[PDB]
Design a protein around this ligand. Structure first.
Ligand SMILES: O=c1ccn([C@@H]2O[C@H](COP(=O)(O)OP(=O)(O)O)[C@@H](O)[C@H]2O)c(=O)[nH]1
Ligand SMILES: O=c1c(O)c(-c2ccc(O)c(O)c2)oc2cc(O)cc(O)c12
Length: 424
């Protein structure tokens, strides 16, 4: 029996891209996939064979729906300026118990109204949604809803607080304070969600509760097995890659060195100062760089050893590079490791700090922090990682694991079962 499956996600292309991958698996099984998201992604969604639904067409008049990607960058400038000078601890101190994505909770009412209307009209058998936190509609619509998580999944475990970037090597005395601050700001997230749920008259749940089934996308070899098991009803999908041939810019043909990809993500690349800071020293690195220059890419200066465009084909490119300098977004991490490339992660915000530290902790690359950044340090990191026989072997081992994953079969079966039975 072929199902009607409805997806949605946050604005961020990181979240959209994770769901595209799951959607593709379900489409292959014979299901009709709908995806409710913003008009800028209609092409990718429809190219995947999914029916596009504009959340903008379902908005209530008193509660409009910004697609925030254009507004982000204005926000991200402030974030960059703080972390570039403050240590993570000082950042948490300066935050004064303000949570990372709490300010986003209030603004989510409009998207909630839209989803209630969409689900009522389209009457799917099941929904999947990739958000930073649970939303009231997920508990009021008349079908099972599965949260999809693509951020670092330490939040699903009972060990160190998420978003702090703690290392397995940090001793008790060092984490005590950052863990107090993290726990304090978690209370702000709860109080913000209380207001949102109260608005819609829905009983409050944990921000990462999965009623029946939740799917987190993270490579099994990097998952937090040393913390036991994730929260109830959460199941791991080892990767989610949406899924062709790529040709190398002639600029970089017959230049010396390895090929290195630089991308600071979809969100953070908006901030031109960040890329400028990073690329400046790389002019003197004896290698060839392909750069994702972001929305404001045209005014970024590139050197003789660099070719860039606003938006690059990351999945096509990665097999052809030797190293990936990344902000440490989850998707980028999964794509880089699938391709078997080592990582230099320069975390900017949120879960990236957790991913960056996990890369370091498991010998898959190095973390560099903004606050102590130097061109000397970066160039050395490049040479070190390129010639570190241990890191490359670890990456090759994880790369092999990721390719042979059969997590998809189990997860699909669960999705199908839940849709049909309405329970378990
Ligand atoms: O030039 C670019 C920049 C980004 N991406 C894609 O954008 C997503 C970025 O997600 P991630 O979690 O790594 O970063 P974030 O979006 O959270 O900044 C991934 O699917 C990348 O493949 C891409 O295809 N080309
Ligand atoms: O505080 C905010 C925040 O943390 C994030 C965020 C964090 C991590 C992510 O991975 C992500 O996609 C978004 O977005 C925002 C977007 C806004 O318009 C306003 C905000 O205040 C935030």
């Amino acid at each position: 029996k072929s199902l009607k499956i409805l997806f949605t996600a946050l604005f961020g292309p990181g979240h959209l891209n994770a769901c595209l991958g799951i959607g593709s698996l379900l489409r292959k099984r014979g299901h009709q996939i709908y995806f409710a998201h913003f008009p800028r992604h209609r092409a990718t969604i429809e190219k995947h064979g999914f029916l596009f639904i504009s959340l903008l067409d379902y908005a209530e008049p008193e509660f409009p729906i910004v697609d925030m990607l254009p507004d982000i960058g204005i926000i991200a400038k402030f974030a960059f300026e703080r972390m570039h000078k403050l240590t993570p601890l000082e950042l948490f101190r300066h935050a004064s118990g303000k949570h990372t994505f709490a300010g986003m909770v209030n603004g989510s009412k409009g998207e909630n109204y839209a989803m209630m209307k969409i689900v009522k009209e389209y009457k799917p058998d099941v929904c999947l949604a990739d958000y930073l936190f649970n939303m009231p509609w997920m508990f009021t619509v008349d079908c099972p809803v599965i949260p999809v998580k693509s951020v670092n999944p330490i939040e699903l475990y009972n060990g160190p607080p998420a978003l702090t970037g703690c290392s397995i090597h940090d001793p008790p005395s060092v984490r005590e304070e950052i863990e107090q601050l993290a726990r304090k700001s978690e209370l702000e997230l709860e109080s913000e969600l209380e207001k949102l749920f109260a608005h819609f008259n829905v009983p409050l749940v944990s921000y990462n509760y999965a009623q029946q089934l939740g799917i987190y996308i993270y490579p099994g070899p990097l998952d937090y097995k040393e913390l036991g098991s994730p929260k109830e009803n959460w199941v791991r999908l080892d990767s989610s890659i949406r899924s062709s041939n790529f040709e190398l810019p002639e600029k970089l043909k017959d230049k010396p060195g390895k090929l290195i990809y630089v991308s600071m993500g979809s969100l953070a690349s908006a901030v031109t100062e960040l890329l400028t800071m990073i690329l400046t020293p790389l002019a003197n690195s004896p290698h060839r760089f392909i750069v994702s220059t972001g929305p404001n890419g045209d005014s970024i200066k590139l050197y003789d050893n660099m070719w860039g465009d606003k938006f690059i084909n990351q999945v096509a490119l990665l097999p052809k590079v030797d190293l990936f300098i990344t902000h440490g977004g989850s998707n980028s991490l999964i794509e880089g490791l699938t391709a078997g490339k080592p990582l230099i992660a320069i975390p900017q915000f949120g879960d990236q700090l957790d991913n960056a530290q996990r890369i370091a902790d498991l010998g898959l690359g190095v973390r560099l922090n903004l606050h102590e950044f130097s061109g000397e340090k970066l160039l050395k990191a490049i040479e070190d990682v390129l010639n570190d026989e241990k890191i490359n072997a670890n990456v090759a081992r994880v790369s092999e694991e990721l390719k042979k994953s059969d997590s998809k079969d189990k997860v699909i079966s669960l999705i199908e079962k839940l849709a049909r039975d309405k329970k378990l």
